[PDB]
Design a protein around this ligand. Structure first.
Ligand SMILES: NCCc1c[nH]c2ccc(O)cc12
Length: 382
């Protein structure tokens, strides 16, 4: 086809898919590699490398162009996967995590920027960013079972080998299509990152996205270390308790990518934050898994609402009241994502150890509810 416009969507979607496959299949492999706390230190290290790397990639992607960081991300992700598979020492795990963070940052930021650049009209742009961000749910949904069956059936390194084969298969395509053999700088100079961080609307959007993803990032490690404490659940229910969140996030991200602009971006974000707050408030006093599935469904659906309805609004803001570039603003969006992901596990575990887990749920819900009215300012920015 001519320039294969939807193929950019496909490549971004599959890049996020495989990024989350790496981000999730690592969970049961970390304790096995460590034996043959510091178990969560790898996740924090990857997220911190990600955070440090996002602004530099944001400047780089309009310094030289969009396809070069995407190809570099595919190369560094393949290298990270290979090294992770052939990893024994703890420092090997750390360097694999660092390369993983570099790849995730550059791939996500460059893909979002290129997707924003190719598609300008708000309807289709919201649609395609919702479809692409559906990969963020698809990867974590298909991660655990695929990884577990390939790990426990044929070998430990076999899932990584098959994943590397898939990554190479996707790198074979979008190489001639994107033809990144030559550098192509941007038509116009972009706004500096400093002035974007002085813009109240961009800051409000980044903060709301950060708090929304922060809720899930806090819930991810704290829930398994809580059901064993009070309902004394077995290991069979550990994955099932967090399972519905992925389905809810996928459904919300896929459908409100078209429903959001029809209904209203600011109102959708406010409703999503309110639903996050009430659902997280509902989680702790529930006692059985039957009473825990529904609030998890709600929180996943509302996170999908916020993300799918408020990822394209950053591009909308920078297009309406700034220079028409998206690399830096999507870099700060990914900074919000992964600063939440960084201070999620470790800080959440620390505050749960110091103060009761129901108090943690209540305080996160209170913060979400209190910050939710601040999304009203996005109704009509000057
Ligand atoms: N935007 C990602 C937030 C989120 C919602 N549900 C999730 C499940 C797994 C995960 O890694 C992340 C999430």
């Amino acid at each position: 086809s001519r320039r294969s416009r939807k193929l950019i969507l496909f490549i971004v979607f599959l890049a996020l898919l495989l990024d989350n496959m790496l981000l999730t299949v690592v969970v049961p492999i970390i304790p096995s590699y460590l034996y043959s706390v510091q178990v969560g230190l790898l996740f924090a290290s990857k997220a911190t490398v990600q955070l440090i790397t996002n602004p530099f990639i944001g400047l780089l992607t309009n310094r030289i162009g969009y396809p070069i960081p995407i190809f570099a991300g595919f190369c560094i992700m393949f290298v990270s996967t290979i090294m992770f598979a052939f990893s024994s020492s703890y420092a090997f795990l750390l360097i694999a995590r660092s390369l993983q963070g570099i790849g995730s940052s550059c791939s996500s930021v460059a893909g979002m920027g290129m997707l924003a650049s190719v598609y300008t009209d708000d309807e289709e742009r919201g649609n395609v960013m919702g479809i692409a961000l559906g990969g963020l749910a698809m990867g974590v949904l298909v991660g655990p079972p695929f990884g577990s069956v390939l790990y426990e059936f044929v070998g430990k390194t076999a899932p990584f080998l098959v994943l590397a084969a898939l990554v190479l298969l996707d790198g074979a395509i979008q190489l001639f299509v994107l033809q990144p053999s030559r550098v192509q700088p941007e038509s116009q100079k972009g706004t500096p990152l400093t002035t974007l961080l002085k813009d109240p609307y961009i800051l409000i959007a980044a903060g709301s996205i950060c708090f929304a993803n922060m809720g899930i990032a806090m819930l991810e490690p704290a829930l398994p270390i809580w059901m064993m404490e009070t309902m004394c659940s077995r290991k069979w229910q550990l994955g099932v308790a967090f399972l519905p969140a992925s389905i809810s996030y996928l459904i919300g991200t896929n459908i409100f990518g078209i429903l959001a602009h029809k209904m209203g971006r600011w109102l959708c974000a406010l409703l999503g934050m309110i639903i996050v707050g009430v659902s997280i408030l509902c989680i702790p006093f529930a006692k059985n898994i039957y009473g825990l599935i529904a609030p998890n469904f709600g929180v996943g659906f509302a996170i999908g609402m916020v993300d799918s309805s408020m990822m394209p609004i950053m591009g909308y803001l920078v297009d309406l009241r700034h220079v028409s570039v998206y690399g830096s603003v999507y870099a700060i969006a990914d900074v919000a994502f992964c600063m939440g992901y960084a201070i999620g596990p470790s800080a959440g575990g620390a505050i749960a150890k110091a103060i009761g887990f129901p108090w943690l749920m209540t305080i996160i819900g209170i913060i979400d509810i209190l910050f939710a009215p601040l999304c009203f300012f996005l109704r009509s920015p000057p």
